[PDB]
Amino acid sequence: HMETHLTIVTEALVPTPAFFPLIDKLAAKANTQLAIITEVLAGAWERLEQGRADIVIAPDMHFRSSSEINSRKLYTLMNVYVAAPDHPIHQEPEPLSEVTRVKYRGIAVADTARERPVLTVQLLDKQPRLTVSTIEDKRQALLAGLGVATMPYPMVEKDIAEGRLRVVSPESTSEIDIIMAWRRDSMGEAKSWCLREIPKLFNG
């Protein structure tokens, strides 16, 4: 109904290309131009709170208890603690022991900058770390043997199969619920349509 602009935020763990089917359909449904922006952890939620994002696709988080924010579970994602095959972490009797983990470099994706608070990986103080902005940069660092870190399984599935990466220990494997969140204090055609279409991209 004349040109419109909707802004979807996909957190770093969420593949942006999964939302590409929406683009053509949104151009036919309305005259709506899509913006699918990437943010990291709390940065995704912050965008929603500050009213700078129509819909957020992100891991379930403590922010969700907000009264004017609706939310719905989309799918589950698996996180695996990986390292390059030749990394010494593999020869460790107790790779997840606090005494062992400090010996080896962790790799973190920043949310705004170097931020100690993280839940995916418990980086310890005095432990070496590398910090990057993108999930791809983190992958390349891991492929190059530069540290040990958690990754979304889809992004490293081929890597593990083809022996470029190796799961450090299955004990650390975690499941994260990926949720769709939005604010009820505003509504439009395009936003409503997306809220209905996005779940269809995944389960049903």
**The entry of its own copies, Na ion, none that residue 144 binds, CB within 5 to 8 Å by partner kind:** its own copies
**The entry of its own copies, Na ion, none that residue 94 binds, CB within 5 to 8 Å by partner kind:** none
Shortest approach of its own copies to residue 121 CB, angstroms?
7
**The entry of Na ion, its own copies, none that residue 8 binds, CB within 5 to 8 Å by partner kind:** none
**The entry of Na ion, its own copies, none that residue 59 binds, CB within 5 to 8 Å by partner kind:** its own copies
Q: Which residues bind Na ion (CB under 5 A)?
A: 16, 38, 134, 137
Task: Report d(CA 63, CA 69) in Å as an integer.
Answer: 9
Using CB positions, name the residue nearest to Na ion: 16
SS3 state of residue 127: coil
Q: Do residues 70 and 40 make contact, with C-beta atoms less than 8 angstroms apart?
A: no
**The entry of Na ion, its own copies, none that residue 76 binds, CB within 5 to 8 Å by partner kind:** none
Closer of 93 and 196 to its own copies (Cβ):
196
SS3 state of residue 62: helix
DSSP conformation class of 184: T
Shortest approach of Na ion to residue 16 CB, angstroms?
3
Shortest approach of its own copies to residue 170 CB, angstroms?
20
If 0-12 CB within 10 Å is exposed, 13-18 middle and 19+ buried, where does residue 2 land?
Answer: exposed
Shortest approach of its own copies to residue 42 CB, angstroms?
4
Q: Measured at the alpha carbon of residue 76, what is the angle toward residues 172 and 40, in degrees to the nearest 5?
A: 75
Closer of 28 and 93 to its own copies (Cβ):
28
